[PDB]
Design a protein around this ligand. Sequence first.
Ligand code: HEM
Ligand code: HEM
Ligand SMILES: *[C@@H]1O[C@H](CO)[C@@H](O[C@@H]2O[C@H](CO)[C@@H](O)[C@H](O)[C@H]2NC(C)=O)[C@H](O)[C@H]1NC(C)=O
Ligand SMILES: *[C@@H]1O[C@H](CO)[C@@H](O[C@@H]2O[C@H](CO)[C@@H](O)[C@H](O)[C@H]2NC(C)=O)[C@H](O)[C@H]1NC(C)=O
Ligand SMILES: *[C@@H]1O[C@H](CO)[C@@H](O[C@@H]2O[C@H](CO)[C@@H](O)[C@H](O)[C@H]2NC(C)=O)[C@H](O)[C@H]1NC(C)=O
Ligand SMILES: *[C@@H]1O[C@H](CO)[C@@H](O[C@@H]2O[C@H](CO)[C@@H](O)[C@H](O)[C@H]2NC(C)=O)[C@H](O)[C@H]1NC(C)=O
Ligand SMILES: *[C@@H]1O[C@H](CO)[C@@H](O[C@@H]2O[C@H](CO)[C@@H](O)[C@H](O)[C@H]2NC(C)=O)[C@H](O)[C@H]1NC(C)=O
Ligand SMILES: *[C@@H]1O[C@H](CO)[C@@H](O[C@@H]2O[C@H](CO)[C@@H](O)[C@H](O)[C@H]2NC(C)=O)[C@H](O)[C@H]1NC(C)=O
Ligand code: BOG
Ligand code: BOG
Ligand code: FLP
Ligand code: FLP
Lengths: 552, 553
Amino acid sequence: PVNPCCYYPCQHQGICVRFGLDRYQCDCTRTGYSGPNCTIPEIWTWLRTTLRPSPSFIHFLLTHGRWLWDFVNATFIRDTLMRLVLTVRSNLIPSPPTYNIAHDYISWESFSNVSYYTRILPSVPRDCPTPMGTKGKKQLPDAEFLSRRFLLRRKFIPDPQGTNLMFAFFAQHFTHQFFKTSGKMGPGFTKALGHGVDLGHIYGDNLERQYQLRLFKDGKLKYQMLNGEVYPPSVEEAPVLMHYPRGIPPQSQMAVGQEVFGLLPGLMLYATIWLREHNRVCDLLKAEHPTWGDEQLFQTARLILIGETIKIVIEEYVQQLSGYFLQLKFDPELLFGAQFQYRNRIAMEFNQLYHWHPLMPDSFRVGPQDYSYEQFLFNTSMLVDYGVEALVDAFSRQPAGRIGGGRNIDHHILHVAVDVIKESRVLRLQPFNEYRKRFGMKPYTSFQELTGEKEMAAELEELYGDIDALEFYPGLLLEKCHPNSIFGESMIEMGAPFSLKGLLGNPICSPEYWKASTFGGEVGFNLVKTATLKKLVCLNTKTCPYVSFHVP
Amino acid sequence: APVNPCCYYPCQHQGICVRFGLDRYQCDCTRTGYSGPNCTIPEIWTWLRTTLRPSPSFIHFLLTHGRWLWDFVNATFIRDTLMRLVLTVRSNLIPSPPTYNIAHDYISWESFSNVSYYTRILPSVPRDCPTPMGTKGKKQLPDAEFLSRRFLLRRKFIPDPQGTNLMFAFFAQHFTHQFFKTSGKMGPGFTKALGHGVDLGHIYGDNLERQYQLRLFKDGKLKYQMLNGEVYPPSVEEAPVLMHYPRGIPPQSQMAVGQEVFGLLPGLMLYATIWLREHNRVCDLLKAEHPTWGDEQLFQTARLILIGETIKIVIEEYVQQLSGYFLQLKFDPELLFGAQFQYRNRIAMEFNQLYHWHPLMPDSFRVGPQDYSYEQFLFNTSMLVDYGVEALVDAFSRQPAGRIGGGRNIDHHILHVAVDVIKESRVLRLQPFNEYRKRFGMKPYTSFQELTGEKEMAAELEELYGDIDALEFYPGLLLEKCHPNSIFGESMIEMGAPFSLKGLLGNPICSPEYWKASTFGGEVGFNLVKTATLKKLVCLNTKTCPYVSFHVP
Ligand code: HEM
Ligand code: HEM
Ligand SMILES: *[C@@H]1O[C@H](CO)[C@@H](O[C@@H]2O[C@H](CO)[C@@H](O)[C@H](O)[C@H]2NC(C)=O)[C@H](O)[C@H]1NC(C)=O
Ligand SMILES: *[C@@H]1O[C@H](CO)[C@@H](O[C@@H]2O[C@H](CO)[C@@H](O)[C@H](O)[C@H]2NC(C)=O)[C@H](O)[C@H]1NC(C)=O
Ligand SMILES: *[C@@H]1O[C@H](CO)[C@@H](O[C@@H]2O[C@H](CO)[C@@H](O)[C@H](O)[C@H]2NC(C)=O)[C@H](O)[C@H]1NC(C)=O
Ligand SMILES: *[C@@H]1O[C@H](CO)[C@@H](O[C@@H]2O[C@H](CO)[C@@H](O)[C@H](O)[C@H]2NC(C)=O)[C@H](O)[C@H]1NC(C)=O
Ligand SMILES: *[C@@H]1O[C@H](CO)[C@@H](O[C@@H]2O[C@H](CO)[C@@H](O)[C@H](O)[C@H]2NC(C)=O)[C@H](O)[C@H]1NC(C)=O
Ligand SMILES: *[C@@H]1O[C@H](CO)[C@@H](O[C@@H]2O[C@H](CO)[C@@H](O)[C@H](O)[C@H]2NC(C)=O)[C@H](O)[C@H]1NC(C)=O
Ligand SMILES: CCCCCCCCO[C@@H]1O[C@H](CO)[C@@H](O)[C@H](O)[C@H]1O
Ligand SMILES: CCCCCCCCO[C@@H]1O[C@H](CO)[C@@H](O)[C@H](O)[C@H]1O
Ligand SMILES: C[C@H](C(=O)O)c1ccc(-c2ccccc2)c(F)c1
Ligand SMILES: C[C@H](C(=O)O)c1ccc(-c2ccccc2)c(F)c1
C-alpha cells in the first residue's frame, strides 16, 4: 500500500498520522480547519483568508508612494505596522521547534538535541513512489546539469536594488554565525548551537575557543598592531583552530571566532571591524565601572554588540534587502504585549534559502586594481595591505548581483549550488509547491507561471515532469523576481518569518533582559539603541570612507 | 575602603543594583512598578494591588476551609478560572529567560546558554561585604553541624498532620531526582540534569548513550528482566550503565536504571520499576494502533506520554496532597493558551535547597509485621524482588511520613545531608532568608520569635545569628512555624510553588505547538495523559492492586 501521507493529504498545517497498515489521519488541531484533510474553514478563518490581499499587492504598496510613507514613518502608525509585520511574520515559525532530520514527529530528543537543524515540513516519506512523494519522475534532474543549464552565470546581472559587496559580505559574515553545518556529522547537523545571533562567529562556538581569543584584561579580546592598526591576533598568539590552506604558518594566520573566515578578505574585514568594536565598548564600560572585572566587562561588551548587530540588521540590512518605504524599526518593546516565545532554532530550509551566492561578482575591483577570484580567495595579505577604510569604500561602491532570476551564479562557486541541491535530496525536503502553501501562498500551476517566461519554463518542465515536483532551492532561485527587485515573492514570504523570529526571538529582546542594567547603564543601552553601520565602521577607523549597503 | 553599596541590598521590588564609579550604585527599577532611587515609590496601580492583597495566611485559610463551598465551586467553571489564576500569578515570580548563575551575578550570554549551571533568583552576597550575609549578623556564621543538632535533629518523630505517607515521600524523592542532579565533579551550582525539568531523564538516562544502553530497541521498549514471573529493571550486566552501588555488591545484583543513584533505596527502585513497567505497556498500546511505526517513534512517543502522565499526577494528586487545598487543582495546558507564558524552565539553586525535605523520612520502615531499620533498608538490593511492587506500595502507602516544617524532625541517620546543605548555601553565598521573603512577595520577619512562633529556640537562634536579617535561607525555611495542621509553613509554599508550577507548565509539551493529540500518537496516547492517575499507574502494572495513595488511609 502506498504510504497515504505521500499524498500530503492534510492541508493548513494539519498533521498526517499514519494508522493501521493503510490508513492515515490529519491532526487539524488549531488549524482553523476541520474535515478529514483539514479543508473546511471556520467562519473566521474563511474571512481572514478571503480578505487577504496578495503578497504581490502588499509588496507594491510598500515600495510605492514615498510621500505617503514619509508621513507614516513619522506617526505612531510606523510602530503599529512594525508590530504587525513582527507578529504576523513570526507566527509562521513553530516554537518550540518540531521536526529534525531524524524525527518527522515531535519528540523530546528533537526538542532537546540542539545539534540538529530543525525543519518546518517533515521529509518526503522514504517509502513514496517518486523522490518528491507522488508526482514527478522517478529520478530527479542531475544536480550538476540543472546547475549549468539554469543557474550558471552567462553575463553578470547586477541587482537593481543597488545592493553592493559591503552588504553581500555582511550577509555572509552574519549568517555564518548560525549556519555552521557539522561536516563530521553530516547534513542536518550544526556546530552553531547558539541557533541565532549569539555572535559566536566573533567569540567562538565553544568556551575553550573563547578563552583562547580572550585577552583577559578589561574584558578585551586579543589583537595585534600592524601598520599601527589593530587586527585579529595571529594563530600563534591565540592558538585557535583556523581553516587556512596547508603550508600557511600560524604566525601567518589571523585567529577569529569562525574557523572559516580566513578564506576571504571581505569576511576578515568584518571580523576586524567587530573586534575593534568589542574592545572599544570594553573601554566605555571600564570608564563607567572601574570596579568591574574582566568577565563582567567581557560579558556586558558581548551583549552590547549582540544588540548592535540586531539593530543594524533590522534597520539597515533588511531595510536595504526589502526596499520598503516603510521605515523598519528595532524596538523589542513592540512585542511586550504579544504572545511571543523568546526562543529560536535554525531550520534547514533557512540554510538552503540563504545560499545567496549569486550576489558575488565576476571580479573584485579595489580602486584602479581589479582582482580575480584566484587573487582574492585565500589572499592572506590584502586586508593589511589596504586597511579597513580602503576595502570598505571599495565594497561599498561595487554592485552585487541579482539573487532571484536564474543563470547569475559565477562559474567559480557554482559547485556550492550543485551541493545544495544534492543535500536537499539527502534531507529529502518536500516540493517547492508544498512550502509555498506552508508559507501562505498558492502553489504554482505551471513552470511558466513560476519563471514568468517560456524558454526556461519549458525545459524545467521537460526535466521535472510536474511543477508539483519542483525542488525547494531551484524553485526559489528560478522564480520570477518582483519588478526591479533582487528576488521574487517566495524568498520574502519564506525567508522573512525565519528571519524576524531569529532576531526578535533573542533573549536580549525579552522584557526580562531589555533593561538598561543588562547593558551596563544608559551608556551601553544607547550604544545598542543607536547602532549604525557608519558608526560601526567609522568609530573604528582613522578615516571614514563611503560606507553603505546601497551602492552610491 | 568604601563598602560595596550593594551589600545593603538597596534596590527594592526586584530593582537591579548596578555599581557605578568606586563608591556609587544605581537601581534599575525598569518595570518594577516602583520608581525612585531604591525602587520604592509605587505607581497608583501597584499601590492598590499591594494594599489590597490579602495575606498568604488569609488565603491559605480560605483554601483549606468551607469544604461544602469548595464542593460547589469545584463544579462550576470557577475552578478553571482560579486554576488559571494560580498558574499565572505563581509563575510571574520566576524569571524567563533565566538570569544569574553561580558565576554571574549579572545577565550574560554565558548564563543564558551554559545549561550546566543551576540558575538563581537573587545574586549572591557580594564577596566584598562586611559580614557573610551582607551588612548584618555576626562576622562568622553559626557552625553548620551545631546548628543542625540543636534545631534540626529529630528528638521524637513528628508525623505529618496532613496524612502524607512514604508512598508520597518516595515519589517526591524519585520525581525531584530527575531535575536536581548536582555535578559532583564540577562543584555546587553545577548540574548534570541538563533537561532542567520534567524530561523523565531519571528513567531514560541524562544522556543519549545511557538511553541507548537501557533501550531494548524493539517496539520502542526499554530493557528489563523477569524475576518471580515479574518484570524488573535489567541487570547492569544486561544494560552496562554506570550505577552507584557500594563496592562489593555483585553486578549480578545491580539493577540498571536512568538515575545512577536510584539503587540506594527500595523506595526509589520501586518507582523506577513501576515506570519501566508503564513505558513498555504504553509501547504496546501504540504498536497496536500504529503497526507501521518503528522502534524510535514508538520509544519517542511513549516517553512523551509518560512525561504527560507524570505532569498530571504531580499537579492533581502530589501537589493536591501537599497543599491540602479544597480547591480541586487541575492539569489543563490550555488554561495558559491565552496568557503570555514562556514554555522554558531552568532549575534554580534555591529550589534545590528548599526541596531537601529529608524530615519526611521515618525512624524505620515498616513492611507489614516486619519493621526494617535504616541499616536494613538503605542499599538493600533484595527487598524489592522479595516483596514485589504490590507489597511495598501498600506498605509505604500506609506508613505516615514526618512533618517537614517546624524543627527537630530529621532522623539522625541522614542529618549529615542537612549539615551539607547549610555549608553549600554558604559556598553559593545565598542571600538572607528575609531577602528571599521579600523577593517572593512576603514581609520580612522582625524577630526570631515571629518566625518560630515561640521563645526558647528563637532566643538561642538570636544569640547565634545576631540578627533576624542574618538568618540563612534553608534554616529559615525549616525552622519557620507551620500553618495550622500543615506539613510546613508559609514560606515553603510561597517560595516553592512558583518554582514548581513554572517547571511543570513550562514544559514544551504544554505549549499549544505540542498539546495536540498527534503529539501522543492519537486520542489513545492523548487520553493516557489526560486521565493519568496514581492508582492506574500502579495497578495497571501489578498482578493485584494494593492500597495505593499519597494519603495514609
Ligand atoms: C566569495 C564568495 C563565496 C564563496 C567562495 C562561497 C563558498 C561556499 C562554500 C564552498 C560553501 C560550503 C559548502 C558546500 O560546498 O556546499 C558555502 C556554503 C554556504 N554559503 Fe557561501 N560562499 C561565498 C559567498 C556567500 C555569500 C555571499 C553568502 C550569502 C550570505 C553565502 C552563504 C552560504 C551559506 C548559508 C552556506 C551554508 C553554510 C553551512 O551550511 O555551514 N556564501 N559557501
Ligand atoms: C532514605 C532517605 C534519604 C536519604 C538516605 C537521602 C540522602 C541524601 C544525600 C546523601 C544527599 C546527597 C548530598 C549531600 O550529602 O548533601 C541528598 C541530597 C538530596 N536529597 Fe535526599 N535523601 C533521602 C530522602 C530524600 C527525600 C525524601 C527527598 C525529598 C524529595 C530528598 C531530596 C534531596 C535533594 C533535592 C537533594 C539534592 C540533590 C542534588 O543536589 O543532586 N532526599 N539526599
Ligand atoms: C483527502 O485527500 C485524499 C488524498 O489526497 C483524497 O482521497 C484519495 O485518497 C487516496 C488515498 O489517500 C489517493 O490515492 C487519491 O489520490 C485521493 N483521491 C482524490 C480524488 O483526491 C480525498 O478526496 C480527500 N478527502 C476529502 C474529504 O477531501
Ligand atoms: C544528538 O543527536 C546525535 C544524533 O543521534 C547524537 O550523535 C550520535 O550519538 C550516538 C550515541 O553517542 C552515536 O552512536 C552516533 O555515532 C552519533 N551520531 C552522529 C551523527 O554523530 C549526539 O550524541 C546527540 N547529542 C546529544 C548531546 O544528545
Ligand atoms: C593578494 O593581494 C595583493 C594586493 O593587496 C596582491 O598584490 C598586488 O598584486 C597586483 C596585481 O594585480 C599588483 O599590481 C600590486 O602592486 C600588488 N600589491 C602588493 C602589495 O603585492 C597579491 O598578488 C595577492 N595575492 C595573490 C595570491 O593573488
Ligand atoms: C536607599 O538605600 C540606601 C541603603 O539602604 C539608603 O542609605 C544609604 O546607606 C548606605 C549605608 O549606610 C550608604 O552606602 C549610602 O551612601 C546611603 N544612600 C545613598 C543614596 O548614598 C538611602 O537613604 C536610600 N535612599 C532612599 C531615597 O531611600
Ligand atoms: C559551562 O561553564 C563551565 C564553567 O565555566 C565550563 O567549565 C569550565 O570550562 C573551562 C574551559 O573548558 C575549564 O578550564 C574549566 O575547568 C571548567 N570548569 C568547570 C567547573 O568544569 C563548561 O565547559 C561550560 N560548558 C559549555 C558547554 O560551555
Ligand atoms: C534486605 O531486606 C530483606 C527483606 O526483604 C531482609 O530479610 C528479612 O530480614 C528480616 C529481619 O532482618 C527477617 O525477619 C526476614 O525473615 C527476612 N526476609 C527475607 C525474605 O529474607 C534482609 O535482611 C535485608 N538485608 C540487609 C543486608 O539488611
Ligand atoms: C459566509 C459563510 C461562508 C462559508 C464558506 C464556506 C466555503 C468552504 O469551502 C470549502 O472549500 C474546500 C475546497 O473547495 C472544500 O474542501 C470544503 O468542503 C468547502 O466547504
Ligand atoms: C453567516 C452564515 C454562516 C454562519 C455560520 C456560523 C457558524 C458559527 O460557528 C461556530 O464556530 C465555533 C468555533 O468558532 C464552532 O465550535 C461552532 O460549532 C460553530 O457553530
Ligand atoms: C521586514 C520584511 C518583511 O517581513 O516583509 C523582511 C524581513 C526579512 C527578510 C529577509 C528574507 C530573507 C533573508 C533575510 C531577510 C525580507 F525579505 C523581508
Ligand atoms: C498549587 C499550590 C499553590 O500555588 O498554592 C502549590 C503548588 C506547588 C507547591 C509546592 C511547593 C514546594 C514544593 C513542591 C510543590 C505548593 F506547596 C503549593
